[PDB]
Write a protein that binds this DNA or RNA. Structure first.
Ligand code: SF4
Lengths: 1122, 783
DNA sequence: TCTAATGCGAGCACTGCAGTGCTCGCATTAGATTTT
């Protein structure tokens, strides 16, 4: 069965539809069914290729195809005579179901000729692409420096830390990369200046950015008052303060007014707690003052208008970068992932003087409906592409989108959830003359205590400017699980107070072992004890990942976490590269030493220093050689070196003829480093690391780069800048996604969010554009500009929204049990901070206090306190709080040298001593020609070479003639020429070959005895191809064991038959006269072997016998018999 | 190829091999690159390293090394473009460098003469050809052909002069079609480039007994017993309709209806895929294996194709095996299939013993395998391999016979050399013991910048005195002039004239200038206030110089003559007698942390101070008491204030930020001698203040003369205890973490020390952040 | 780089030379720390 909401999503039609699918909505199943119907229905079915389905991964798309396939089979078994249904089953491979990028690719491939794009274009990975950006940038900056334009230097002096210019070039990238999130980058770039065009005559309450200044003041002022009022309830001077505040609240609108007021005017438990509340006012007001009111509205304006010249320079720079970048790609026929979307949009839009091009029209025609998953993460470029392949205005049309704003956690990649949210508020629950929207509340996959705990917290947290979304019914999760009633399913909070992570990791570790030793049986299925793989620890970031893993594996099950970097500081990688470095250039003291001391060689410290002694001044490399040369053979350290120096020179030569990836593998199998690395702790991850280096070398050969040197720098770049077992899985909340677990630990909840983004001298924003500090290089003075401050306030409450959703996916990824684990300093006090916040009724916490939040605790804590004022504390959510004070053999030693002392003792012995019986024939060529790529046996350019022929080419020419000469009778010098000319006409002879033929030497043969005999005969044939199977030995004596037959193939020049028997004939252009009496013996032995094979072939295959064989020689016209 | 090479399985591949990795193809490409990108040294050595330019008859061994050394050179000196075309130790070197380029430049150079001059194709294709012959490519090729054979590789030897024809036929066809057509390198090279990519090697002829590895389309087979099918992945096996060619699937399908038949290509192929997988599945007589990988080359997920599903429909009860390199995941049976070869047996056993010590119960097949390998001849190696089982990165203490002859008779100490030791004993061994040197580049590093400032400042003095002038007599006009000229004299002679190399650097020039100009003005303002007058400047301390080195005698025949520099020493007369303080110019902010001093990380200032004090008596005939140690911050500031400021107040804020940080003396007068402008409140020149009563503030960085003479002694004992450990031959590895920071930051020797925390026995020695007093009393307790 | 965040020293108000809290101001000092 379905819910009415699912049923709606499945059957609705006639307009755009937005499906808000909560966690575990079963959206996939519903998405499948909807397509299944339109494709398999009695009324009037449609083919699959008429649908467009975009997903966020090729795996989920592939997943889509499988589930579509099954249902088709099922639908088929019932209608076994369905021609349409069977056909659809064949269309799934031709259907468009993929990531939007995957679609864009198909578009570019098809309509490439409309834009400027080389078919067979290549997609560069985000790495080489950036490395190209660095290059074009350096060229750009160099050109500007040389051009010496005034404006340029003003921009540089201003934004780069003098003493180096590095800082300017990532601002350029940062800006560029941002612009690409816009359907029209350039325009959006030129949009920057419009903000900085202002006068002292301008109204600040008007312009765009002040919106966030307005709302900021509103909060703080109100937050002040609301923070004071309680001090009054605590029960004088708070009325002076208060009255003054009210006076400010009256003028919240007038900014110029605030500049006049704000700057100028401004029990021992509850007694000393009421004083800090009054300080809250001070602190909040002081900040309010410093931010906006330390300078006049007029001076703020002047400060702004002054930076306009700079902003223009900056923009024109980024634009020049964009052009150069694109041009650089074109040269190498490549594109980025941004290009993929933008070129597609370019194809889809053909504007003259904005039009949905005829390419667009095709896709609008082709797709009857378009389905987009994870829509909350869509950007502007994608959306404009979507709106373009979708046919019809919003009221009607075939756009069908599904997702959940509450689960939008990717804004740092510039995804726009407001796009989804704007449509949700624009759409009605019905379909009347607008986009139809549907909600999926039921969570079929999670237990009640989960949904209740999650619904409980985010009801007091998500909302207004922090949540960006009102948390209400039709939004709240609803129970659809059939879970049996059981306890210890309660959500737990473990509060604890470098070692921070240690005390944090153990608390986690503990309850885990509680779970394992204790029953706790996970779940018409049946209960299951904890397999360690059903439990997971989710972190926001991965600085603690390594530390956690350690002690969690210190006792019991090990830990698996998907590590990203720290890869270049990995010992193996270091050593491996070190080896490649020495192979490239042996003259590097550090890289060489790093190898010699590594397990690969294993030199001692005394051995290393011993080496240097030989030569102190010279580089270490030859200090090693100098040790070798004069060294004594019986020396151990000498061995180690000599062996290594042997490999080095082998590797040196090897890379010369081979690729980098190949050399790497060779080094791995020569040193057995990868094998060795598998024998030390964590050797599994180490081996992986060692073989991704090989993979990256593979990815590197397909790039615009080549050679070992470039590869090294390539890796050097990555360094400098970017970089079925049952175990506890440690992973980021961001990587959690559609994944799901019985038990979920979310730790680090007591750690600050990353606000580092809002600090620097500049900020990039979608709406507002570019913002920066006022900076004067001559006066050496700088300070935040008004827009800058405005962009921060906005960005902070948007960044905070993101975190509340990140925390929302964390809790929803659980099916049965939850662990919330935070950390702080002083227990009680924070709970008092929380008490202060948790007073206000209405559920949803104070919009300002949520704002002040820094750490996840600041969200949970206060929302948790009020729980355990009617429904809030009676809410069917359960919790368990823990206040933690934070403080509370022979075989190896045999292996160390020799062997120990089995069931397989006998088999292991023979398999290692085994041999391939037919081995010695495995390297021998099957076919072997005698004169097709399947057989075996200093040229100068024709334009620089002579005019004539070579002895070989002449011979071939002479040969051809003899084989085409009519054997009817004895030809004359003339009749021979006629043949030579006929060949020439028919093109069996090149103009040269013709002129190179000596007719006499050809006619001569037919005057010899053999000639006359050839003429007069019962039967004759020439150019006779043959293949003769022989025992391998018969040719190759060397190998003696295997007697498998090989094919010897050749052509018998001539065979003729007389009343005597069968005779053989061969013409040879060998040079003789320069008598022939002495040449005969030599010639005889030259073709001695060949001729026997000929007769062999005839005698064995034809089962007749060859009596005598003649050879003719054009030089002198001789003959000899064998 | 790799896998089967290891597993010793002979095979035959349908496809052919690209020639893009062949020396001849490279040499050609890189050559054109050399004269297009205008002699980027990367390209030059790209050609030289195909060693087709190598001198004739001269032993390769040397040649390589000479080439490498030349490479290093070109890298550190940024040699490019025209630079190419333009007594004991340096002769050997510099001449080798002139010999090497002497056989490199001419051939590659003469070519560019030819190329650029030639207009049409044929003459360009020809100029290229000569470049090959005049360098004797054929000869050297043939030579290399031999070495391949003598090493057992004939196949490789065959591809050599087989590569020779490929390039020629390319030229021939080129000059055939467009030979007499005009054109220049831009397009000419592009076509050569596309020619190389297309170049192929002759298909490797089949052998009597081989495994047949080929495609699933046009490959043919006969009498096949067992057939394995690879990549049954979805999107792969029933290959998604390929989007290629000039005509779209739509176009072709349309043409059909007009009575025109073309190649299928689009959707028909997808119909034909089933026939092709049908022939594949029915190919073998005995067995059929259909496999698919779960993960990706990079780790992405991969699903099976619809074929596997249907196979499961025709054989619902058929189980499907698992292919893994983790034998413990399978039964003893399968685990016995890994012992196919010595090498692979080893590689697997090593990993099994590992996972075994981890408390996991392994299979006895590997114990058997172990004992077998342990009974052979190459036992030795396997033994090595298995030593990995217990590998703790171990540093064997040096011995006496080595440390002595290595480190030398006298250990000529440096304050920096001592800091590097106590930072991490191993780093010392690598730097001063093994004398390891990083590769030099043409980048201007942060430190060398400092060396500029010094010499600039030192230079400014000389001219001041020469005009009988002093910093305080200076004007804002003069500060600028004087400073600029200083960098003029210097810039060209700094770091391989990198400042003159590119445009970005000549901007970095006046950048460094404007800094000095400011610092010059600040010093003036500091001289008009300070009552301290400089005595010695850049005082030569140790070795050959104004002062005797300070010596260290300790048990075990130890000798430590440590040398050093003294940036500035200043004198001021008070009622308490002579006063001496030391100033050192610095790039960063903070100067002295007592916590760092305890562990001997910062001994610079305190050690300098002693000498000045101690030697004061003899030196200038008077006993001095320490005024303190100061750090001057060299930089051009950016103040940030919310308060609007006038030029008046701006100069104040700029001035305040050069406020010196360090360690002072805690009496009223010493402060006032350092800042004579100060009456009450805080000082902008130095970190100290004065209450109304005349006493200074608790915020002052000042301490009693006792504490000063306390630290000084501590620095001594450090040089002693750390001075002997060296002679003892201690090279151990012990990085510190304090406070939350480490010495491994930019440390170059990290790859040599190979420090691994996870691996036990390798630890970070912790140091604790300490209130200046908390390490103060610690010192007090020592003696 | 860069917000909080304590210190330390007096100036002032609050009440009885004089004391006590309170407050401000100026600086250095921690203490921090991304996602794919
Ligand atoms: S990185 Fe660490 S272990 Fe390595 S040399 Fe430096 S201080 Fe020593």
């Amino acid at each position: 069965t379905w819910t009415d909401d699912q049923w709606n999503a499945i059957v609705s039609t006639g307009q755009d539809i937005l499906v808000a699918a909560a966690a575990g909505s079963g959206k996939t199943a519903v998405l499948v069914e909807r397509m299944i119907r339109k494709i398999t229905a009695e009324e009037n079915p449609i083919d699959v290729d008429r649908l467009l389905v975009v997903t966020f991964t090729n795996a989920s798309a592939a997943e889509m195809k499988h589930r579509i396939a099954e249902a088709l089979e099922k639908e088929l078994v019932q209608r076994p005579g369905s021609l349409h249904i069977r056909r659809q089953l064949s269309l799934l491979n031709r259907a468009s179901i993929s990531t939007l990028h995957s679609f864009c690719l198909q578009v570019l491939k098809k309509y490439y000729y409309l834009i400027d794009l080389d078919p067979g274009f290549r997609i560069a990975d985000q790495t080489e692409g950036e490395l190209i950006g660095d290059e074009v940038l350096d060229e750009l900056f160099e050109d500007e420096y040389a051009k010496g334009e005034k404006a340029f230097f003003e921009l540089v002096d201003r934004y780069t830390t003098d003493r180096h210019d590095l800082d300017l070039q990532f601002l350029v990238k940062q800006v560029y990369e941002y612009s690409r999130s816009h359907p029209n980058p350039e325009a959006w770039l030129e949009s920057f200046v419009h903000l900085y065009d202002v006068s002292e005559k301008s109204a600040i309450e008007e312009l765009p950015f002040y919106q966030y200044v307005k709302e900021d003041i509103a909060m703080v002022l109100n937050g002040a008052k609301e923070k004071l009022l309680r001090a009054l309830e605590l029960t004088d001077n708070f009325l002076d303060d208060l009255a003054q505040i009210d006076e400010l609240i009256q003028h919240q609108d007038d900014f110029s007014e605030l500049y006049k007021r704000v700057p100028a005017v401004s029990d021992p438990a509850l007694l000393d707690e009421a004083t800090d509340l009054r300080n809250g006012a001070k602190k909040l007001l002081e900040k309010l003052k410093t931010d906006y009111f330390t300078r006049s509205p007029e001076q703020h304006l002047k400060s702004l208008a002054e930076m306009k010249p700079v902003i223009e320079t900056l923009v024109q720079l980024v634009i020049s970068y964009g052009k150069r970048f694109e041009a650089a790609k074109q040269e190498k026929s490549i594109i980025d992932f941004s290009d993929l979307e933008h070129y597609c949009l370019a194809i889809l839009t053909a504007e003259n003087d904005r039009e949905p091009s005829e390419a667009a029209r095709f896709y609008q025609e082709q797709f009857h409906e378009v389905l987009v998953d994870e829509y909350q993460d869509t950007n502007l470029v994608q959306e404009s592409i979507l709106q373009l392949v979708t046919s019809g205005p919003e009221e009607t049309g075939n756009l069908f989108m599904v997702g959940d704003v509450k689960q939008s956690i990717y804004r740092f990649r510039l995804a726009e959830p407001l796009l989804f949210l704007s449509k949700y508020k624009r759409f009605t629950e019905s379909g009347e003359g607008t986009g139809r929207k549907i909600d999926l509340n039921k969570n079929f996959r999670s237990r009640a205590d989960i949904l209740d705990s999650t619904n409980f917290l985010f009801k007091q947290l998500m909302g207004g400017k922090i949540g960006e979304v009102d948390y209400d019914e039709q939004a709240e999760l609803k129970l659809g699980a059939a879970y049996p009633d059981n306890d210890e399913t309660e959500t737990e909070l473990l509060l604890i107070d470098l070692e921070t992570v240690q005390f944090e990791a153990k608390a986690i570790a503990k309850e885990i072992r509680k779970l394992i030793s204790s029953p706790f049986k996970v779940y018409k299925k049946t209960h299951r004890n904890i397999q360690y793989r059903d439990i997971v620890i989710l972190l926001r970031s991965m600085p603690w990942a390594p530390q956690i893993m350690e002690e969690l594996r210190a006792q019991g099950i090990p830990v698996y976490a998907n590590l990203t970097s720290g890869y270049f500081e990995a010992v193996e990688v270091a050593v491996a590269l070190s080896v490649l470095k020495v192979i490239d250039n042996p003259y590097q003291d550090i890289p060489l030493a790093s190898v010699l001391r590594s397990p690969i060689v294993g030199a001692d410290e005394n051995e290393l220093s011993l080496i240097r002694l030989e030569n102190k001044k010279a580089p270490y490399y030859e200090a090693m050689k100098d040790y070798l040369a004069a060294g004594d053979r019986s020396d151990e350290l000498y061995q180690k070196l000599n062996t290594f120096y042997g490999h080095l020179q082998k590797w040196r030569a090897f890379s010369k003829n081979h690729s980098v990836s190949e050399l790497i593998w060779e080094v791995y199998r020569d040193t057995k480093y990868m094998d060795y690395v598998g024998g030390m702790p964590g050797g599994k991850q180490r081996q992986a690391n060692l073989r991704v280096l090989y993979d990256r070398a593979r990815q590197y050969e397909s790039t615009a780069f080549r050679g070992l040197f470039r590869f090294l720098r390539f890796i050097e770049r990555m360094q400098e800048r970017g970089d079925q077992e049952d175990v506890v899985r440690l992973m980021t909340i961001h990587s959690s996604k559609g994944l799901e677990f019985p038990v979920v630990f979310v730790a680090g909840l007591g750690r600050n969010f990353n606000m580092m983004d809002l600090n620097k001298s500049y900020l990039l924003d979608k709406e507002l554009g570019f913002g920066t500090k006022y900076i004067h290089p001559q006066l050496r003075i700088s300070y935040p500009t008004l827009p800058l401050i405005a962009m921060k306030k906005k960005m902070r409450r948007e960044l905070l929204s993101e975190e509340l959703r990140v925390l929302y996916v964390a809790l929803t990824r659980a099916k049965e049990k939850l662990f919330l684990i935070g950390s702080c300093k002083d227990h009680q006090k924070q709970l008092a901070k929380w008490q202060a916040s948790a007073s206000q009724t209405d559920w949803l916490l104070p919009e300002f206090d949520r704002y002040q939040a820094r750490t996840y605790l600041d969200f949970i804590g206060p929302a948790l306190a009020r729980h355990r004022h009617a429904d809030i504390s009676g809410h069917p959510a359960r919790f368990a709080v823990q206040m933690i004070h934070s403080y509370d053999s022979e075989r190896l030693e045999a292996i160390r040298r020799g062997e120990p002392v089995f069931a397989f003792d006998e088999k292991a012995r023979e398999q290692l001593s085994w041999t391939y019986p037919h081995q010695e024939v495995t390297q021998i060529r099957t076919k072997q020609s005698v004169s097709d790529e399947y057989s075996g046996r200093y040229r100068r350019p024709a334009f620089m070479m002579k005019k004539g022929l070579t002895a070989a080419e002449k011979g071939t020419a002479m040969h051809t003639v003899m084989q085409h000469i009519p054997l009817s009778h004895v030809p004359s010098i003339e009749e021979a020429e006629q043949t030579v000319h006929r060949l020439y006409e028919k093109e069996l002879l090149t103009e040269e070959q013709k002129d190179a033929i000596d007719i006499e030497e050809i006619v001569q043969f037919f005057h010899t005895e053999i000639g006359g005999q050839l003429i007069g005969a019962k039967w004759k044939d020439r150019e006779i191809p043959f293949s003769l199977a022989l025992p391998a030995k018969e040719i190759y004596p060397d190998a003696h064991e295997a007697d498998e037959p090989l094919l010897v193939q050749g052509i018998i020049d001539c065979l003729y038959e007389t009343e005597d028997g069968l005779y053989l004939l061969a013409y040879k252009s060998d040079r003789i006269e320069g008598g022939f009496e002495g040449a005969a013996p030599i010639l005889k032995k030259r073709y001695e072997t060949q001729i026997q094979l000929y007769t062999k072939a005839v005698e064995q295959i034809a089962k007749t016998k060859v009596k005598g064989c003649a050879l003719y020689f054009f030089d002198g016209g001789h003959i000899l018999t064998l | 190829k790799e896998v089967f090479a290891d597993y010793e399985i002979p095979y035959f591949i349908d496809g052919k091999a690209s020639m893009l990795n062949h020396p001849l193809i490279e040499f050609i490409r890189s050559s054109l690159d050399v004269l297009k990108g205008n002699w980027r040294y990367e390209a030059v050595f790209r050609c030289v390293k195909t060693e087709l330019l190598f001198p004739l008859n001269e032993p390769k061994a040397k040649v390589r090394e000479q080439v490498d050394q030349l490479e290093n050179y070109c890298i550190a000196y940024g040699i490019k473009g025209d630079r190419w075309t333009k007594t004991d130790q340096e002769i050997e070197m510099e001449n080798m460098l002139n010999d090497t380029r002497d056989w490199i430049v001419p051939p590659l150079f003469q070519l560019q003469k030819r190329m650029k001059k030639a207009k049409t194709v044929q003459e360009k294709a020809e100029a290229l050809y000569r470049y090959l012959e005049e360098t004797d490519v054929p000869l050297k090729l043939d030579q290399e052909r031999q070495r391949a054979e003598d090493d057992g590789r004939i196949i490789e030897a065959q591809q050599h002069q087989q590569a020779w024809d490929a390039v020629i036929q390319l030229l021939e066809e080129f000059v055939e079609m467009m030979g007499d057509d005009e054109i220049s390198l831009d397009l000419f090279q592009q076509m050569i480039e596309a020619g190389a990519e297309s170049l192929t090697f002759s298909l490797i002829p089949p052998a009597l007994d081989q495994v047949f590895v080929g495609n699933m389309d046009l490959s043919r087979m006969y009498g096949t017993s067992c057939t394995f099918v690879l990549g049954a992945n979805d999107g792969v096996l029933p290959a998604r309709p390929d989007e290629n060619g000039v005509l779209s699937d739509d176009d072709r399908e349309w043409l059909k209806t007009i009575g025109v038949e073309l190649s299928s290509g689009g959707r028909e192929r997808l119909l034909d895929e089933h026939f092709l997988i049908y022939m594949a599945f029915s190919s073998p007589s005995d067995r059929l294996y259909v496999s698919y990988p779960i993960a990706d080359a990079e780790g992405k997920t991969l699903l099976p194709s619809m074929i596997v599903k249907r196979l499961e429909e025709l054989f619902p009860h058929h189980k499907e095996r698992l292919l893994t390199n983790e034998p413990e995941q399978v039964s003893d049976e399968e685990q016995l299939m890994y012992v196919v070869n010595k090498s692979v047996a080893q590689s697997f056993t090593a990993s099994q013993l590992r996972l075994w010590t981890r408390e996991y119960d392994i299979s006895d097949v590997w114990w058997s395998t172990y004992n077998v390998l342990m009974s052979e001849q190459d036992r030795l190696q396997s033994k090595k391999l298995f030593s990995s089982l217990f590998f703790r990165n171990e540093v064997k203490q040096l011995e006496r016979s080595v440390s002595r002859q290595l480190y030398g008779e006298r250990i000529q100490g440096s304050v920096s050399r001592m800091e590097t030791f106590n930072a991490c004993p191993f780093s010392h061994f690598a730097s001063h013991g093994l004398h390891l040197k990083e590769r030099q580049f043409f980048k201007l590093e942060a430190p060398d910048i400092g060396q500029l400032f010094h010499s600039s400042l030192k230079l400014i003095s000389d001219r001041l005195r020469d005009e009988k002038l002093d910093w305080r007599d200076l004007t804002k006009e003069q500060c600028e002039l004087f400073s600029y000229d200083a960098v003029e004299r210097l810039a060209p002679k700094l770091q391989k004239e990198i400042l003159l190399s590119s445009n970005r650097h000549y901007y970095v020039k006046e950048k460094l200038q404007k800094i000095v100009t400011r610092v010059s003005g600040i010093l003036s303002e500091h001289a008009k206030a300070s009552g301290f007058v400089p005595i010695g400047l850049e005082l030569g301390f140790g070795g050959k110089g104004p002062l005797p080195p300070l010596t260290f005698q300790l048990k075990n025949g130890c000798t430590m003559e440590l040398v050093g520099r003294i940036d500035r020493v200043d004198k001021a007369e008070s009622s308490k007698g002579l006063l001496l303080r030391i100033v050192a110019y610095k790039s960063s902010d903070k100067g002295l942390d007592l916590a760092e001093v305890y562990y001997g990380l910062a001994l610079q200032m305190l050690t300098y101070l002693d000498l000045s004090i101690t030697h004061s008596a003899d030196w200038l005939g008077m006993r001095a008491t320490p005024a303190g140690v100061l750090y001057f911050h060299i930089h051009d500031p950016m103040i940030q204030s919310n308060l609007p400021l006038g030029l008046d107040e701006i100069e104040q804020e700029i001035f305040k930020k050069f406020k010196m940080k360090g360690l002072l003396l805690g009496d009223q007068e010493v402060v006032r001698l350092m800042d004579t402008t100060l009456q009450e409140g805080r000082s902008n020149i130095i970190n100290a203040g004065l209450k109304k009563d005349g006493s200074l503030r608790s915020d002052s960085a000042a301490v009693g003369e006792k504490e000063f003479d306390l630290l000084t002694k501590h620095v001594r004992r450090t040089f002693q205890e750390a001075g002997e450990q060296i002679t003892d031959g201690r090279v151990s590895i012990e990085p510190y973490k304090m406070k939350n920071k480490t010495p491994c930051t930019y440390c170059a020797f990290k790859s040599v020390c190979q420090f691994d925390e996870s691996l036990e026995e390798n630890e970070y020695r912790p140091l604790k952040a300490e209130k200046d007093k908390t390490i103060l009393e610690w010192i007090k307790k020592e003696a």
